[PDB]
Structures are given as C-alpha cells and as structure tokens.
Amino acid sequence: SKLRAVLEKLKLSRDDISTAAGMVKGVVDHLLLRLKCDSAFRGVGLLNTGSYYEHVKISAPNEFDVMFKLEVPRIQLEEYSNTRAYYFVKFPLSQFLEGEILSASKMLSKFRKIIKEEIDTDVIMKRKSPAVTLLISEKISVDITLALESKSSWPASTQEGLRIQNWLSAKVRKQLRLKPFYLVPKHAKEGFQEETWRLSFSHIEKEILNNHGKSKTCCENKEEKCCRKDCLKLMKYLLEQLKERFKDEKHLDKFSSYHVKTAFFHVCTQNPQDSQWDRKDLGLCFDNCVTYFLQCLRTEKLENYFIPEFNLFSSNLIDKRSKEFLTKQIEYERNNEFPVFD
C-alpha cells in the first residue's frame, strides 16, 4: 500500500498534460515547418520518443523527447574503434560531407543554428547529448534530436540484442528488426570524433513499453492490469530522488533513468510471463527490479538491450567507486522500506 500511494503521487495531472501537450505542439510544429524550408532538412518528420510517449513519465509532464527524423537512402556504416554503438556514415547533404564521410557535427551545427534563429511562447535554448534542448515558459524541457533514418538491416552489433523471443515472441522480434534504425549526432570519445553518429532504437523502446505483455490484451482490461510500468516508474523515482538528495555528490552524476530503463527491460526478459507482474505482487515485483539493478551494479554489467557488447556499466563509462556508492544508497533504501519515498 505504501508503494501504491507513491504511485498515486507520481501520476501526471490531466490539466498539466493538456497544457503541456499544446505548448510542445506549438513549438514542434513551428520548428518542423521552418526546417522543411532548408534544402538539407526538407524531408524531416516527427518521431515522439522517451518517457512521456511511453507513459512512464513521472510527477509532471515537464520533459519531452522528440526525434526529427530524416530518411537518408543508401547509407554505408563503418564502426568506429570497436565501440559497437558509434559509426561513420558514408553514402542536399553534400554540404556536410568531409570526403565521403557525412559529418555528424556539421549536420548538427546547421540543425541547431536553424532552430536557434527560429525560436505566444517564451522559448530559450539550453547550452550545447545529441539533442537541441529547449525550455518552454521556464517549465517544459524539450529535447529535439536530429536522427538519420535507415531502412536497411540493423548493424551487426545488434545481432544478439533484443532478446525478447520468450516474452514478446520471435515473430515480434522479426517484425521489430524490419523497422528502420536511427543514427543521432552523439559523438564517440577520442576529445570527440566529431564525425561520428550513435545508433538509437528509441522507437523500439517505445513499441515495447506500449505493447509490453505476453498477452496481447495486457493492460486492456481489469483482469490483465500488470505492474510492469508501475515498477519502471518506481525505479525511475528511486533514482531521481537519490540523485536529487545527493546532487552535490559526484558519484551519482553519471547515472540516468536510461540505466534503470535498460535494467528494467532485462528483468522483463528474465520474467516473461504476465503472471510474474501481477498487480497484487507490486512490492515483490519492485523488489525484483531493485535486486536486479543491484546485481548489475555489483557485477559492473548492464548490457545495452539492443547492443549487447555495449556495457553501460563499464568502468570506461562509470567508475567502480560510483557504482559502489549507488549500491550503498539503494541497499539502505531497500533495507529500510524506501524512506526516500516518504
């Protein structure tokens, strides 16, 4: 009942939803119209992503993630430095070519420049993530991310990813792998290799979260109201609260809600049946998520759900001392019934 009461507090107000949805639409629509006038961005289209469009945004609808996707035919990818997730792209995009290489930084710079010049709305741009980040009315943040869309087969680094066959089905895995993949202008470390792009499957994360049960009717009727999204919301709030309490501790700076989202997908793979997420077992299901995440921190292993050889918890990305620090705080919370929720 304590956790149910937490979830009630995390619910988004209907009035805040209605107001925020309109504020975002006015800004997104204006920017799309302007970008389409530029020869380079003429084919841009909207793809809504992230927690709001997955219905796992908590507390307030004050942060929205959108991709401005651009179909680019006939791309050839070259993996950068065995990073598994970062690539060079080769083939009105000639202005962005360095030789045969399509520069992520040059395309992002023009995209940001156009947005900056274009912004009944108070809109400011936050300093230069692949996103151009806007703040509407001092309240609503919007991450606008240029994304190249490729309709080709997914890169080889994904061959063993997306291990959903025992949960969502092999047929679904095959359908999802026929969808496009995206490249966003987030550069690999080098200093950054400023031509490099990063693979993204944010659209598939949304597809899974909004169609998340083994039963096709999961969450469509009162007898099948599972606790999967509630558990992700509680894990997100646990991490948010810890990061806020420890905001002056560097140890928590590199953790993000994507770490809990990725751990959560792995728990769904481990626990594929809807009866393992029954509403009446909320506390146990949340505990399964917390203990799984603790195991990831201890073993220093959290594979990207789509790119298994990309380890989000590698010491190259997050120091061992930082993972041990977060382990200590989560263990204290688990051992004391989550006082950070009170």
Ligand SMILES: Nc1ncnc2c1ncn2[C@@H]1O[C@H](COP(=O)(O)OP(=O)(O)NP(=O)(O)O)[C@@H](O)[C@H]1O
């Ligand atoms: N480290 C990462 N690796 C890959 N994709 C990422 C990473 N961080 C963020 N993303 C993607 O960017 C999207 C938006 O990021 P963000 O707004 O930080 O998180 P979110 O999923 O929307 N949850 P929230 O904290 O509620 O905003 C995520 O849903 C992911 O698809």
Ligand SMILES: Nc1ccc(-c2cc(Cl)c(Cl)c3[nH]c4c(c23)CN(C(=O)CO)CC4)cn1
């Ligand atoms: N609309 C979207 C969706 C997906 C991506 C995105 C994609 C990839 Cl592959 C990576 Cl590694 C990413 N890292 C970050 C993001 C991102 C976006 N992001 C936030 O949204 C912070 O609130 C920062 C950090 C970007 N914008």
Ligand SMILES: [Mg+2]
């Ligand atoms: Mg978000």
Ligand SMILES: [Mg+2]
């Ligand atoms: Mg964001």
Ligand SMILES: [Zn+2]
């Ligand atoms: Zn469900």
